[PDB]
């Protein structure tokens, strides 16, 4: 699951360690590494999760 999430998030401009830091701090712990099937199946909402995670760096 770490390879699928890190594989899917990388082309958006952020890796796994940048991605989880928005989820643990922003109170958006939703993914929880079992939800890789939106990073695989339907990425138009996982990209919005990237949009919610990239603004939570500070």
Partner 1 sequence: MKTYVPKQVEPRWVLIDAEGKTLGRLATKIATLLRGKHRPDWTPNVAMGDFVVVVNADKIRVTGKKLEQKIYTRYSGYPGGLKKIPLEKMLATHPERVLEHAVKGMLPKGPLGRRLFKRLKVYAGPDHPHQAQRPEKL
* Segment interacting with partner 1 (CB under 8 A) among 7-15, 16-24, 25-33, 47-55: 7-15
Q: To which residue do tokens 């712990």 refer?
A: 29
* Segment interacting with partner 1 (CB under 8 A) among 14-22, 25-33, 39-47, 50-58: 39-47
For residues 14 and 54, the answer to whether their CB atoms sit within 8 Å is yes
Minimum distance from CB of 37 to partner 1 (Å)? Answer: 7
Question: DSSP states of 15-52 as a string?
Answer: -HHHHHHHHHHTT-TT-TTT-THHHHT-HHHHHHHHHH
For partner 1, the binding residues (CB under 8 A) are 3-4, 7-8, 10-11, 36-37, 39-40, 43
């Amino acid at each position: 699951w770490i390879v699928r999430i890190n594989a899917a998030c990388r082309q958006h401009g952020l890796n796994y360690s940048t991605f989880i830091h928005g989820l643990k701090k922003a109170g958006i712990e939703v993914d929880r590494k079992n939800l890789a099937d939106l990073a695989v199946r339907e990425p138009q909402v996982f990209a919005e999760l990237v949009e919610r995670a990239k603004a939570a760096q500070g």
